[PDB]
Amino acid sequence: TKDLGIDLGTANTLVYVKGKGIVLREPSVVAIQRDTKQIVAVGNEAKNMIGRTPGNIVALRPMKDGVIADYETTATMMKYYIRKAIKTKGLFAGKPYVMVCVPYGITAVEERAVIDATRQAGARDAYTIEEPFAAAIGANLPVWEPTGSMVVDIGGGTTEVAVISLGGIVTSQSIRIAGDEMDEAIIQYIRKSYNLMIGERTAEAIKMEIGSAGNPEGIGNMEIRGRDLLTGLPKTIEISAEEVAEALRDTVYAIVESVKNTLEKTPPELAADIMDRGIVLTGGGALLRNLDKVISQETDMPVIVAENPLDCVAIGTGKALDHIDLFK
Ligand SMILES: Nc1ncnc2c1ncn2[C@@H]1O[C@H](COP(=O)(O)OP(=O)(O)OP(=O)(O)O)[C@@H](O)[C@H]1O
């Protein structure tokens, strides 16, 4: 019987097996029959279904923009990801134990729902770890010592800020402001400034290539193709990093404010530890050009992007399987 940690992200799902490490990296996507709502495929299998299936099948991210997925969706996705990860040719394989990463502050009712869905999906039993703690373990922070640590996980739908000390979360804030809203800010900006409509792929490409959080000087320029909203015809334009930084500015400073505010609620001595140690960013949204510089300047604090920021949460969920009792 294997032991799994699962990060069912708003954009990316990762499964970690004790002993092996991360074995699965697939988008958090479902293929749904538009009229019956039936989920017909998950993950990569959902991707393999679209364009190849007669019915009105649609690929959707159930947690886009940090929306909480309902019970049935959660249990259907979990069942796919659990089955795919423990796929070994053999016998005498018991139902796995599963650590599920969850948001900070989940109500006891919601937590029971996650556990129930995860057992329903095939787990012998399921446990939870709060995401900022998973993230801090995966970023090699000293979560068990008395010193203050700070982590900021920016994903697709959610940013989570947490000061950690002595094996617990001391102060924490979660906002639905992250990679999806950054993409939407770019789409809206081009829509108002150029009466042009671009899709999510293009907004993502724009954000990765010339997106930036602070001074955009020297980042350059991009040619992008979209649809003219007056004529309906494809149309190509030129956008500057200055424009993109301007489009992102309010999203960035919502994130910066969450960091500042959390620090301002934290016990002063844990803050001074953080000032010495530094803030660690995790999640794919931490890769936004110069976000680490901006947060450092607005807090007068060191800021480091953790190595492999897209895996920290999943690694931390995996290492929690070494001391399961501490999460029961
Ligand atoms: N180079 C980059 N610059 C900016 N954003 C990036 C970059 N690479 C990836 N991202 C963003 O990171 C996000 C995905 O990160 P991640 O997988 O950590 O999110 P998530 O699935 O919501 O995670 P979780 O729910 O576990 O916190 C996407 O919004 C993506 O656009």
Residue numbers in the entry: 6 to 333
What's written in the study?
The electron density map clearly revealed the presence of three phosphates, demonstrating that the ATP had not been hydrolyzed into ADP. This is probably due to the absence of a Mg2+ ion in the catalytic site. No residual electron density peak could be interpreted as a Mg2+ ion with appropriate coordination. As a consequence, the binding mode of the nucleotide is distinct from other MreB structures, with the γ-phosphate located in the Mg2+ binding site. The structure of the ATP-bound form of MreBGs is highly similar to the apo form, with a rmsd of 1.41 Å over 313 aligned Cα atoms. However, ATP binding induced a small closure of the nucleotide-binding pocket, and loop β6-α2, which was disordered in the apo structure, is fully visible in the electron density map. The hydrophobic loop α2-β7 and the N-terminus also display an alternative conformation. Despite multiple co-crystallization trials, in the ATP-bound state the crystal packing only revealed monomers and never straight protofilaments as in the apo structure. Comparison of the crystal structures of apo and ATP-bound MreBGs shows that only minor conformational changes occur upon nucleotide-binding, in agreement with what was observed when comparing crystal structures of MreBCc and MreB5Sc in different nucleotide-bound states.
